[PDB]
Enzyme design. Structure first.
Site, PDB file in Angstrom:
ATOM      1  N   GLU A  99     -48.548  84.391  27.873  1.00  0.00           N
ATOM      2  CA  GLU A  99     -49.515  85.473  27.745  1.00  0.00           C
ATOM      3  C   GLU A  99     -49.559  86.337  29.003  1.00  0.00           C
ATOM      4  OE1 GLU A  99     -50.783  85.800  24.849  1.00  0.00           O
ATOM      5  OE2 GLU A  99     -50.588  83.807  23.948  1.00  0.00           O
ATOM      6  N   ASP A 141     -49.919  93.338  23.627  1.00  0.00           N
ATOM      7  CA  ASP A 141     -48.990  92.214  23.530  1.00  0.00           C
ATOM      8  C   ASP A 141     -47.559  92.669  23.261  1.00  0.00           C
ATOM      9  OD1 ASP A 141     -51.342  90.781  23.769  1.00  0.00           O
ATOM     10  OD2 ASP A 141     -50.758  89.273  22.284  1.00  0.00           O
TER      11      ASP A 141
END
Ligand SMILES: C[N+]1(C)[C@@H]2C[C@@H](OC(=O)C(O)(c3cccs3)c3cccs3)C[C@H]1[C@@H]1O[C@@H]12
Length: 436
Positions: free
Chosen positions: A208, A217
């Site tokens: 992440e 993302d």
């Protein structure tokens, strides 16, 4: 006759030698190995330092005290002996508190404490501990006979004047022993259960990532902190609305280092409790090893309890130890196509067993705390319980039991360096390479 007194005194002298050569071996090993130049070892270093000064001064002067059954070296000698003794032991128990809160904050605070800890910070915390222990005991002993007016301790004995009453002595025992013990006990049982989550975090920091601002993302989805998807819609106005809903105030976009850390734990615990609750994830989680568990969490932390519940053929192979058969089974999904860079490292974990794809040092339980705490408790408990007993009466406890319990608190400083060699293999080979 009393030749047994001379014999026992020689045994204590032997015990004192084992203590000082054991502690100096720790100090030397730390300064010659280079591979032991970590933070936790520096805490054990100071613990060895406190055990050294209490094993070269306190054990010797107490030996002469029980030998001639008196103190014939003036009052200043007795006052300075007890001062250095109590300070060193109080700095010892505070050091144990430091270590306890050290690797506990390494769990609960992966960014605030774990990602910000040097040897310099350790020296400050330890230095602070010795300062506190100094101010608490040294002026309390010396400037007490200069406070009341006259000295209570008669020529021929050596004890503490303000510990005359058994009530104030028991109160000190609670605030200086019973309270630290219960804390270290609580913390230790909150470490042994929460040690597996420490490495669960380092995986999510690589996949992440970490950022205070709001980005997107590997697919263009709003996310702040460490993999916390605020929303899925390409609208910024509603993205911050969910952000402020989790914080509590108008962040206006960015957050802090502590807020991101907090929001991280809210999604991890929700994932784990989302696994146990789910009927298709709970048996799989209990069928995998503790190392393979963080890998499964990584999927739940991202997709969700439902997203992982959509892989029927996959979870079946995980329980049946069909690792290589499930490695190719997960390579045929949207998750493996949309964001494949991280999928390559997750699947590799499920087929090997180790995290060589993510590297990362392995961390299993508290190998050091268990030894030193149990040693600390077993040794000091006969003394502090004896204080509790001595509180509710007078001649119920002989002087012999006081001397033995005082010695049991001394062997604590003797076993502590032995606990180091009875755990880590790096300390083993360093204690072996020495002496030749
Ligand atoms: C090994 N000691 C040097 C001796 C015996 C122990 O005594 C204890 O465990 C006590 O609860 C007490 C000592 C005296 C009244 S209550 C502690 C004192 C300070 C930190 S904990 C610990 C230390 C302390 O100096 C005494």
């Amino acid at each position: 006759t009393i030749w047994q007194v001379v014999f026992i005194a020689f045994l204590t002298g032997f015990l004192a030698l084992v203590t000082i050569i054991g502690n100096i071996l720790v100090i030397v090993a730390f300064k010659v190995n280079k591979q032991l130049k970590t933070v936790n070892n520096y805490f054990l270093l100071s613990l060895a330092c406190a055990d050294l000064i209490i094993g070269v001064i306190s054990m010797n002067l107490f030996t002469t005290y029980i030998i001639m059954n008196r103190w014939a070296l003036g009052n200043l000698a007795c006052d300075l002996w007890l001062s250095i003794d109590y300070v060193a032991s109080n700095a010892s128990v505070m050091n144990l508190l430091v270590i306890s809160f050290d690797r506990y904050f390494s769990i609960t605070r992966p960014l605030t404490y774990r990602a910000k800890r040097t040897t310099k910070r350790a020296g400050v915390m330890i230095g602070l501990a010795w300062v506190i222990s100094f101010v608490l005991w040294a002026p309390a002993i010396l400037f007490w006979q200069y406070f009341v007016g006259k000295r209570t301790v008669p020529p021929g004995e050596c004890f503490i004047q303000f510990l005359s009453e058994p009530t104030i002595t028991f109160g000190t025992a609670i605030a200086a022993f019973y309270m630290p013990v219960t804390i270290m006990t609580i913390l230790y049982w909150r470490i042994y259960k929460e040690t597996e989550k420490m490495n669960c975090f380092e995986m999510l920091r690589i996949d992440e990532g970490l950022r205070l601002k709001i980005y997107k993302d590997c697919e263009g989805y709003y996310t702040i902190g460490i993999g916390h998807l605020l929303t899925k819609s390409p609208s910024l106005n509603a993205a911050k609305s969910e952000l402020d809903k989790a914080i509590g105030r108008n962040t206006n976009g960015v957050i802090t280092k502590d807020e991101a850390e907090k929001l991280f734990n809210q999604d991890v615990d929700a994932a784990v409790r989302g696994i146990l609750r789910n009927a298709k994830l709970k048996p799989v989680y209990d069928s995998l090893d503790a190392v393979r568990r963080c890998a499964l969490i990584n999927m739940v932390f991202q997709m969700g309890e439902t997203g992982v519940a959509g892989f029927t053929n996959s979870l079946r192979m995980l329980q049946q130890k069909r690792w290589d058969e499930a490695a190719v089974n997960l390579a045929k999904s949207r998750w493996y196509n949309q964001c494949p860079n991280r999928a390559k490292r997750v699947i590799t974990t499920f087929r090997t067993g180790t995290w060589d794809a993510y590297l990362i040092k392995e961390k299993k339980a508290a190998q050091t705390l268990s030894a030193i705490l149990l040693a600390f408790i077993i040794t000091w408990t006969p003394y502090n319980i004896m204080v509790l007993v001595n509180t509710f009466c007078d001649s119920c406890i002989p002087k012999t039991y006081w001397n033995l319990g005082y010695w049991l608190c001394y062997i604590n400083s003797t076993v502590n360096p032995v606990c180091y060699a009875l755990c880590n293999k790096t300390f083993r080979t360093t204690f072996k390479t020495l002496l030749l």
